[PDB]
Amino acid sequence: TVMTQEQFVKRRRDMLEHINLAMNESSLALEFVSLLLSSVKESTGMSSMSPFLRKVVKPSSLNSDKIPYVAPTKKEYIELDILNKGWKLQSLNESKDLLRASFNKLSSILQNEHDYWNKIMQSISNKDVIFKIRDGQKLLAIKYGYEDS
Amino acid sequence: SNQALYEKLEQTRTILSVKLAELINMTTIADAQENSELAVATTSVMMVNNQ
Amino acid sequence: MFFIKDLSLNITLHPSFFGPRMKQYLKTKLLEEVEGSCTGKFGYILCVLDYDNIDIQRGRILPTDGSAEFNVKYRAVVFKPFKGEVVDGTVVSCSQHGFEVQVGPMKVFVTKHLMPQDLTFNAGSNPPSYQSSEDVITIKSRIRVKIEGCISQVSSIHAIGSIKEDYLGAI
Amino acid sequence: VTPLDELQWKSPEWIQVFGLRTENVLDYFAESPFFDKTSNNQVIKMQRQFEFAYVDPARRQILFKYPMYMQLEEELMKLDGTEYVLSSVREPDFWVIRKQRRTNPEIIPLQDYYIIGANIYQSPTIFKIVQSRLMSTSYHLNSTLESLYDLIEFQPSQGVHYKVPTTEMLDKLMVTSI
Amino acid sequence: NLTVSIKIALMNIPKPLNSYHIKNGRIYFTVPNEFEIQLSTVNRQSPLFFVDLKLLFNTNNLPLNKPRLEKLINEILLKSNDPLLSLYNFLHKYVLTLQLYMVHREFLKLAFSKS
Amino acid sequence: RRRRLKKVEEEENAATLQLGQEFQLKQINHQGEEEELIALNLSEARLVIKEALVERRRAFKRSETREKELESIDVLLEQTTGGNNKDLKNTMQYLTNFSRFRDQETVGAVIQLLKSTGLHPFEVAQLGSLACDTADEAKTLIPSLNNKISDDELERILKELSNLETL
Amino acid sequence: VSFDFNGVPGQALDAVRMRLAQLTHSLRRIRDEMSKAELPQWYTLQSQLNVTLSQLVSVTSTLQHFQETLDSTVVYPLPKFPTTSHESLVTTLLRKKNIPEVDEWMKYVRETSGVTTALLKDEEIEKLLQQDREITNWARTTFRNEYGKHDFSKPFNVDDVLKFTFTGEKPII
């Protein structure tokens, strides 16, 4: 396939907005936990609160209590289990497709590399001299000058 | 240089030997332990992104 | 233990380094005369902090030697042991007199009088080691030791260790 | 199906007809799906149609301020089992009502329900809150990872890197002319 | 156009800069076969601002440090007592510095021998 | 300034908090003002030294697992500094072996957790350095902690230090 | 009054706050390093992504270790919370609903599991999961036995020769 600038920049923008959403959700969870921790600690929750949350609400604004210890039922055991089975199957399918695509692309690249090395060994004699050179990419440079002869 | 090639080859060989087996081994169910849809989600995404 | 302290050193510059980059020569001689240098007053000085802004004032020419004396003030991380302090380390040598444990840049030698009596020397092992009923102490072994004695010369520091206290020894 | 811990409930027909104040939060809450029909509150409501320990000072203030809730507590001490009691009030509009089991008095609490502007919410578990937030975080992170790996090209001649999409003398002029 | 023409009437003009072309939202101060620099003003009481410049001597259209030269030309227009004489002196010295470096480049690329 | 000989003084001992007259709690800095004595734990010292070395590498240019960490800091060491680095190499190896915490956020969590105690810098650096487990073991490892921290507070703070221990 | 803050878990909430702050700070690193027009070096970016993923695993494992006393504590606002003025804020901070994207994708994987509750009995589901875990056990012992099948100078003295060269005496052997 061939990749273009506009497709590149829309992928850039959508992964930027996805990482923004991930950061937002993680920070919302962190600030909920810190606002609940300030009910009993009052110091370390204030460190993890937002300045905006400190402006809006005061610490010790939430309270929680112990509802009784309950054992989850077998219906939601098997529901969580069948969810786990299906989602592990979906991850297995994604891994299969990723491995297949990587194998195809790497096979194309290695056929190109094998052709390149076969061309090198059918092209270059041991009398010729080769050295590595940068631009930062590695390139082979052959020296044909008479200055050493 | 060749000692570094030894160490890198050996480490990569061991982790290739263990890694796919771990990838499929963590696809198990037990009442290791996943009592939450969050645990299921995290283990499933760490399969693809870690193994 | 590791500390951060304000340090001052009188450094001598030969007149051959009286160039436009005399400050750079001063900083380089500060590096290869302070980094890794041992002093008994301020401990093993490891690395110089804040290399971008090192306080170098005017340097006095010595009236007879002709060299310049700069009183350079700097920030550095040091390592000074103290009596009665518990540190971790690894064994690098063993003998019948005792064994040395490597903490930081310093070797603390633990004498043969300062192990529990069940632990005995075994020189037949290769490398020679110390063996007891429950654990073995050899080269490249993690071990926690208390320093109960420190001697500090002008340029050398040597410490004495012991593991006879409970909840010490190998980790 | 929508689980009960995840919905906001109000009855604006009840708000237009009766109106919500502190004196009618419990029978306003009785119309909610949060309310259990087999509760001691409802059965003593049917019966009536037909200092003290065991409570925190937050509920002491509510009882000593509102007399009908002391009447409710005095009638609930005669029975044992599930009940709803009003724990914290901010006038004019904030309430907290807790599920509560009582034995003869030994009291253990259960799930709570907070009332903000006659809009009733069931108190979720903090596990459920942070777990939903981390589900969202994991989904967005996985999408970020997949979309970033779509931008990865591998070459053997270099390291693995990003796919490539498909005048020097003017300062010398400036310094010479000025 | 009326604003740049109502502004240039109150200012003295350099003798080689008497060729000015008055169209298209700006003024074209030109020196023939040397350069043509175009400037605009916003109002009566504000000093003129750089718009563009075209090089008229044969090499052309060599690329230049456009934002840097715009910044310094606007700066000297703002601070100079006589903006037109200052601009003419600076630009004449700049194009002749360009010409000296160009003949230097030809002389160094000519290296016949250096003996 | 008085010119007494003052040759009599107590021996520097860690249990009595006597670290010498120039490792006192207050230190006059190069700017002239007094400052709290900066005592580092092992992971904190490793991160400060690594930060100094990468800053020096940046200045020279302008002018995680154990195996990759050791070679990375070895290349950093040989790139940054010149001669007489046996001692500094041993410090780097010792800190990367016995570094309890990996990154800056975890170690700064350790400093703020130990500054919530309001305790001695030497004592909190010893707590952050030694991989202790129980309160009584902490008291017998550091005799300086006797009659300073309650047992429940000690066991809980070492409990979240054990939680913060990683890899 | 005191409101009796007690049913509030201290150590579990503190631990999840510390891991969650680590995860949030790593996500902030990824945001302000990756939003720029030029991407960072891919080795550094992959290392940051791996640290972020490992911290997500760590906070999930800490929350799993505190699975109880986290389902067993329900949270309500207090009166000193401004509820009339910031009802949206308190409901956003106390929401347990996760996004329609993740719910539609969990429904998708539930449908593509190939088996559902809607047309099978609970005993049939339990025996299907039992034979499923038996198949996984067979696969992992196959991995175990397959992995166990394979294994996983001086010819002379320069000083002596030069001392001969300058004096004439033979090198000592």
UniProtKB/Swiss-Prot annotation, chain C:
Gene this chain is encoded by: RPB7
Xref: SUPFAM superfamilies: N-terminal, heterodimerisation domain of RBP7 (RpoE) (SSF88798), Nucleic acid-binding proteins (SSF50249)
Similarity section: Belongs to the eukaryotic RPB7/RPC8 RNA polymerase subunit family.
Annotated compartments: Nucleus; Cytoplasm; Cytoplasm, P-body
Note: Present with 6420 molecules/cell in log phase SD medium.
Full protein name: DNA-directed RNA polymerase II subunit RPB7
GO molecular function: single-stranded DNA binding; single-stranded RNA binding; translation initiation factor binding
SMART domains: S1
Keywords from the UniProt entry: Cytoplasm, DNA-directed RNA polymerase, Nucleus, Transcription
GO CC annotations, alphabetized: cytoplasm; nucleus; P-body; RNA polymerase II, core complex; RPB4-RPB7 complex
Source species of the chain: Saccharomyces cerevisiae (strain ATCC 204508 / S288c) (Baker's yeast)
Subunit structure as annotated in this protein's UniProt entry: Component of the RNA polymerase II (Pol II) complex consisting of 12 subunits. RPB4 and RPB7 form a subcomplex that protrudes from the 10-subunit Pol II core complex. The RPB4-RPB7 subcomplex probably associates with TFG1. Interacts with NRD1 and PAT1.
Biological-process GO terms, alphabetical: DNA-templated transcription initiation; nuclear-transcribed mRNA catabolic process; nuclear-transcribed mRNA catabolic process, deadenylation-dependent decay; positive regulation of nuclear-transcribed mRNA poly(A) tail shortening; positive regulation of translational initiation; RNA-templated transcription; transcription by RNA polymerase II; transcription elongation by RNA polymerase II
InterPro entries per the UniProt record, alphabetical: NA-bd_OB-fold (IPR012340), RNA_pol_Rpb7-like_N_sf (IPR036898), Rpb7-like (IPR045113), Rpb7-like_N (IPR005576), S1_domain (IPR003029)
Role played: DNA-dependent RNA polymerase catalyzes the transcription of DNA into RNA using the four ribonucleoside triphosphates as substrates. Component of RNA polymerase II which synthesizes mRNA precursors and many functional non-coding RNAs. Pol II is the central component of the basal RNA polymerase II transcription machinery. It is composed of mobile elements that move relative to each other. RPB7 is part of a subcomplex with RPB4 that binds to a pocket formed by RPB1, RPB2 and RPB6 at the base of the clamp element.
UniProtKB/Swiss-Prot annotation, chain F:
Chain coiled-coil ranges: none
Organism domain of life: Eukaryota
UniProt keyword list: Acetylation, Cytoplasm, DNA-directed RNA polymerase, mRNA processing, Nucleus, Phosphoprotein, Transcription
Any single Gene Ontology cellular-component annotation: RNA polymerase II, core complex
GO biological process, one term: positive regulation of translational initiation
One function term, GO molecular function aspect: translation initiation factor binding
Subcellular location: Nucleus; Cytoplasm; Cytoplasm, P-body
Pfam families (alphabetical): RNA_pol_Rpb4 (PF03874)
Main location: nucleus
Keyword hit for Repeat: no
Subunit details: Component of the RNA polymerase II (Pol II) complex consisting of 12 subunits. RPB4 and RPB7 form a dissociable subcomplex associated with the 10-subunit Pol II core complex. In exponentially proliferating cells, only approximately 20 % of the Pol II complexes contain the RPB4-RPB7 subcomplex. In starving cells, that enter stationary phase, RPB4-RPB7 is associated with Pol II in a stoechiometric manner. The RPB4-RPB7 subcomplex probably associates with TFG1. Interacts with LSM2 and PAT1.
PANTHER family attached to this UniProt entry: DNA-DIRECTED RNA POLYMERASE II
Similarity field: Belongs to the eukaryotic RPB4 RNA polymerase subunit family.
Function description: DNA-dependent RNA polymerase catalyzes the transcription of DNA into RNA using the four ribonucleoside triphosphates as substrates. Component of RNA polymerase II which synthesizes mRNA precursors and many functional non-coding RNAs. Pol II is the central component of the basal RNA polymerase II transcription machinery. It is composed of mobile elements that move relative to each other. RPB4 is part of a subcomplex with RPB7 that binds to a pocket formed by RPB1, RPB2 and RPB6 at the base of the clamp element.
Name of the protein in question: DNA-directed RNA polymerase II subunit RPB4
Organism name: Saccharomyces cerevisiae (strain ATCC 204508 / S288c)
Gene: RPB4
